[PDB]
Structure formats: C-alpha cells, structure tokens
C-alpha cells in the first residue's frame, strides 16, 4: 500500500463516520506521530479556519488536494449551500480525497476536479458555470502560483474582494509569488506567521489525586 | 553568556513588562525557534491550565523552577490571597525565574525557595507555616518524584483532595512513580496524554485580496 491509503485507513479505523472534527484529529496523530504527509496542518488550518468564518464564501476553488484534509477544513465551516471546487493532478490522492470526504459526510459541498489547473482553470466558466470565485486556497506545487493567480486574473475568475490564501510563502518558499502580490496595486496583501507541521514525541501529565492514607 | 540569560533577555527584549501572556509566547517563541529548553512547554502548559481552572488551589508547591515558565503559568491564573511555593536548587536558575516573574510582574504571588526539595520538603511546616498544600506540580530530576511523594506523605503536607500533577511520566518517564500511585489506594489518578515542545520550523500564509486590474 501507499501512504495515503495508510492514512485513509487510519481515519476509517479511528475517526466516526459524519463528524469532521474526528477526521481531522486523526490524520493529525497520524502524520505527526506515524508518517508525516504535506497537509495543510493544524497550526495553519487554524488560520485558514478564521479566514473562512470571516469572509463567509460562497464558491471556493482549492488547488491542490492531496487526501482532503484541507477540504475538509473548508467545507465543514462553509454556509448550507456554499460550495468547493478542487482540483487534483494525481489520480489516486483524487480517489483517497473522495473516499475521504464520503467518509466525512462532507461530499455534497465538495466537488473533486480531476486534472491539473493549468488545463482546468479555463474550463471553470464554460464547463462548471462559474462566474466569480470568492475565495482561492493556493496549495499545490509552489512554481504554479504566479502563473495560476495570472491565469485566473486572464480568464475573469476574480473579483474586487476576492480572497487569495497561498500555504507556504516561507517554506518551501514562493518568493515570485509573493514579489508579484505584494508589488501589485491589484492585491492587498497580510502575511499570517505560523509553522510546519513536523513529527512530534508523546508525553503526559499524570494527576494523582491524595486519598488519605 | 548561558541559555538560561539568552531566554531571559529573548523576553525583556520582546514580551509587555507586566503581561505574563506576553512572556510566555516570548519564551515559547524563543525555545522553539532557537534553542530547545526544557519547560513544560505551550501543549503541556495547556493542561496545567485547565487543572489550575478546575481546583482553584489557595497553595500550589512547584518542585523544579527552571526558568520560570511554569511558574508563570500557574501564578498568572492563581485567585486572590493564592500563593505558588516553588523549589529550585540551582543558584543561577532561581536567580533567573525571579527575574523572569518581576518582568511579569507575578513576584508578590511567588515565593521561592533555593535549596533541593528533600531538604526543604520537611522544613515547610515551620518556616512557612504551612498546613497542608492544595496541589503539587513534580517537574524536577525523575529519580526524585517518588521519594520526593512519599516524603510530602510522611511529612503530612498531604490532605484528602491535594492534586498532584506530575510532568514526564512518559518521556524522559517515571515508571516507579507512575506504578506507585496507580497501584496505590492512596492515590486516583487521571493520565493527561500531550507532546513534548520541540523545535519548529516557521512557515507562514499569505491572504492576497484582489481589487481589480
Ligand atoms: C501539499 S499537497 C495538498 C495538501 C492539501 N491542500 C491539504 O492541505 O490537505 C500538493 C498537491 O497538489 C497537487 N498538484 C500539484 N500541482 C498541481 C496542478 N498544477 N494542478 C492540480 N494539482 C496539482 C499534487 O498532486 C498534490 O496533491
Ligand atoms: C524541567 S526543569 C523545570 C521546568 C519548569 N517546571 C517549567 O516548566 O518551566 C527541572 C529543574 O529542577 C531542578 N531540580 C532538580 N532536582 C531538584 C530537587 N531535588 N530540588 C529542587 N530542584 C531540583 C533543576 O535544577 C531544574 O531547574
Ligand atoms: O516539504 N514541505 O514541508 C511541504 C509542506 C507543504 O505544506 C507543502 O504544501 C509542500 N508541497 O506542496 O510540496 C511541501
Ligand atoms: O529531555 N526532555 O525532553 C525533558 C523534558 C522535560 O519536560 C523535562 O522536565 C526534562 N528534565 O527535567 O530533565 C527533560
Ligand atoms: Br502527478
Ligand atoms: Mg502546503
Ligand atoms: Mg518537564
């Protein structure tokens, strides 16, 4: 087996089916006491959280899906009738982000774009009856995003007020990126500071509460 | 210098003279971005809070001071007319944590004592005259936390209810500690799972908000 099929089937055995919270705390255990895998996080998950809650979004476009941790961090906080697109390059995490997002009860708000941006971005308008984004989560491979922020921008998918959030400026780094959005009149652009998720040494507390003799 | 007089500058330098919060996410900040120390650590510190919440302890005595972080952790969430004891026998570590609790202005919450905790176990009832303690925090040398109990027991500085809360009992691990109060009458215990506070890696997210060509 691969190691998305491992953490697929961590959560099947570990979390409860229906409940979004148990999915992601345990591929949290798993890739930080297990095997570590290129998620989002928990450290930054919970800024995205709090970008998600403050903008409410209608219609998000995701790049970059992995085995669907992030969407289910999106999905799970978005309005009833909100909706994700995401799009994934790599068949098989596309078939484990399904599973994935079946097993959170979330696959109703959540549509899995097979393929990759720079062939699918071009299609959203015709194909997916798109007409703006509210809300882009950039994730995918770093090189991709100045020329997909550029390709969104010549295709019309964004408007005043859309809300880009790009994962990893830092590391492993997305220096022309950053130069161009920070640089342009067309962004307004906040960096929010945080860290890798990296493996991770159990300890614990005992409290032992003194009976008498 | 040492890394003791490294984190304590880190603060004065970075943290709010007066904010205990501020210092402990300048010590946070520092040990885990620079040099790993060993304080309890944010994860662990979590839980220490929430049993500092849920038995409001009038008398807390802390074995192992270090530079402070637990300290101000406890003493910051302490009610009026609360007092932390904490033991400390390094010199240079003592002189440390009461520099660390006068930037965070806790020192009138504090008392400590500068000697080995089986010297001054004993010696508590009469100078300071204690009666018994409401909750003992154990997070010195590991080889000290079951002579170091049965000591408090002999000494009757233990009454029906006193918490003790006891760090590391995984990792480095106190297995004849941890086999003594579970196997004991004398003691009902509760284990509280965490992590260790290692070093991390900083990344960050970028919001770029569009406003038109
Ligand atoms: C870091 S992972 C996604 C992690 C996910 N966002 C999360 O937080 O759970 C990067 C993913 O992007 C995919 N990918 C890379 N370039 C792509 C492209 N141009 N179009 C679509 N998918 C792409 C990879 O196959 C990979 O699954
Ligand atoms: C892990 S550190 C304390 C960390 C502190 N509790 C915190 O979380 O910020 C261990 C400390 O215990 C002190 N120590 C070890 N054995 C002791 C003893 N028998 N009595 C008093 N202090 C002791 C050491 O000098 C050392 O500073
Ligand atoms: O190597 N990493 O730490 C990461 C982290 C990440 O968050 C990534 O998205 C990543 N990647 O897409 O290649 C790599
Ligand atoms: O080595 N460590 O990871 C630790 C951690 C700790 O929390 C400790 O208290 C410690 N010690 O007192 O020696 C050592
Ligand atoms: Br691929
Ligand atoms: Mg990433
Ligand atoms: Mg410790």
Chains 1, 2 share one sequence.
Not at 95 to 111: E, R, S
Request: aromatic content about 8%.
């Amino acid at each position: 087996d691969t190691k998305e099929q491992r953490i697929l089937r961590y959560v099947q055995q570990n979390a409860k089916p229906g409940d979004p919270q148990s999915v992601l705390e345990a591929i949290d255990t798993y890739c930080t006491q297990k095997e570590w895998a290129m998620n989002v996080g928990d450290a930054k998950g919970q800024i995205m959280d709090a970008v998600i809650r403050e903008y409410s979004p209608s219609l998000v476009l995701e790049l970059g899906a992995y085995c669907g941790y992030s969407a289910v961090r999106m999905a799970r906080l978005l309005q009833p009738g909100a909706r994700l697109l995401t799009m994934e390059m790599n068949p098989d995490y596309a078939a484990i982000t399904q599973q994935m997002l079946n097993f959170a009860g979330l696959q109703d708000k959540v549509t899995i774009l097979n393929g990759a941006s720079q062939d699918l971005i071009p299609q959203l308008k015709k194909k997916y009856d798109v007409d703006t984004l509210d809300m882009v989560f950039l994730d995918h491979w770093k090189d991709r995003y100045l020329p997909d922020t550029l390709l969104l921008e010549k295709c019309g998918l964004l408007r005043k007020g859309t809300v880009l959030l790009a994962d990893n400026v830092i590391v492993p780094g997305t220096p022309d990126f950053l130069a161009y959005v920070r640089g342009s009149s067309s962004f307004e652009c906040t960096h929010y500071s945080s860290y890798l998720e990296l493996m991770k040494v159990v300890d614990g507390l005992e409290k032992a509460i003194y009976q008498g003799p």
